[PDB]
Structure 1
């Protein structure tokens, strides 16, 4: 809004090239793909002016797993195969030890935790290591399923409220700002 005041519009959520005053002045088509992505994360995660969003998890069932514990940022979800409910999480909460951990109690052996990834980006490390797919049964859903060790699956069902939820921060994976706005050739 200081340097491209004529040739770039803030239409809706994306940035578009202004059609007037674009004689011989071409944008690098990776640059418009960049800061339309960096203004689409901005409308999912960073809406209020700071990092905060609310996604709802519903636990799932799997063959031969007695209890799955998902802890994020001192918010528990202990599922011992009862009638499943929705636990409305948040991220990133301002608690004392933000992290993410997943521990499953088998039928054969005791509790072996799947991963224990601390830090404020613990949860994005967990959804990166998932095996996610789109969910037909619920909208807008995503049936995550981490594969644990010993061939046991841990199933969950992410429903978010707008856009993609905290799967949208996995657009940032190997993201690079383009070094050139205008292309010259």
Structure 2
């Protein structure tokens, strides 16, 4: 219908044009060195005040409704399935990582053990976890955390060598780039838990368990890899 087509043009002018100008050729969308701006991303995907949420409220209130964090179509106006997938992916990321109106989440890590590993050191935005042999406990982390030098790093001591660096990933997305490198799987019998494993250069495993406050915690940001904001709302 003409109303549907005018809405598609408005969606590009009000939202998509600016989204692509901000995030083209930026990590996490692409595996590149240049980082997406977290405050700019918040301005687009904030749950209630973001540019996308406001567009949905101002133009689609009668055909699309919130169901907690989900966006559900109200039972020549058929939605582009890519548009529905995209807004649902962004609403899930906003619910986990942008609750305060800016990027910010908490999670906990518990260090694990591995044959031949004497020590592990994981750092994110100057929050350090050194594990040698203390009783393993859950350490709370914040992402992002205010620092002059943001980034994440991981190191280990083996039975064959002194301290070695697995990776040093600078920038506000350092933690996310590091998580992208881990082997990840559901933790057996751990509520909202994931077993993380980084295979170090000597073949040894650097093991941790991740526990979140909600959903996938920081792993949710990986849903932005190769993410495309559709240019159309209706088919």
**What band does the TM-score fall into relative to the shorter chain?**
over 0.9
Unaligned runs of 5+ in 1: 19-23
- The equivalent position to 1:125 in structure 2, one of 161, 172, 177, is 177
Mapped to 1, the partners of 2:182 and 2:126 lie a distance apart of 21
Instruction: Report the Cα offset of residue 5 of structure 1.
Output: 3.0
Per-residue CA deviation, residues 16-40 of structure 1 (Å, 9 max, x unaligned), is 112xxxxx31000111011011111
Per-residue CA deviation, residues 87-141 of structure 1 (Å, 9 max, x unaligned), is 1001001112111000101111111100000000000000000001001131121
Instruction: Report the Cα offset of residue 150 of structure 1.
Output: 1.1
- The equivalent position to 1:79 in structure 2, one of 131, 156, 173, is 131
Instruction: Report the Cα offset of residue 81 of structure 1.
Output: 2.1
Size of the aligned set, in residue pairs, is 178
Mapped to 1, the partners of 2:216 and 2:62 lie a distance apart of 32
Instruction: Report the Cα offset of residue 180 of structure 1.
Output: 1.3
TM-score by length of 2: 0.74
Instruction: Report the Cα offset of residue 55 of structure 1.
Output: 0.3
Per-residue CA deviation, residues 134-177 of structure 1 (Å, 9 max, x unaligned), is 01131121000000011111100101111111111111111001
**Runs of 4+ in structure 1 over 6 Å off:** none
| CA RMSD after TM alignment | 1.0
Unaligned runs of 5+ in 2: 1-56
Local SS of the residue matching 2:80: coil
Mapped to 2, the partners of 1:56 and 1:66 lie a distance apart of 22
Per-residue CA deviation, residues 57-106 of structure 1 (Å, 9 max, x unaligned), is 00000101111000111111000122101110010011121110001011
- Contact kept? 1:61, 1:81, Cα under 8 Å: no
TM-score by length of 1: 0.93
Mapped to 1, the partners of 2:60 and 2:215 lie a distance apart of 28
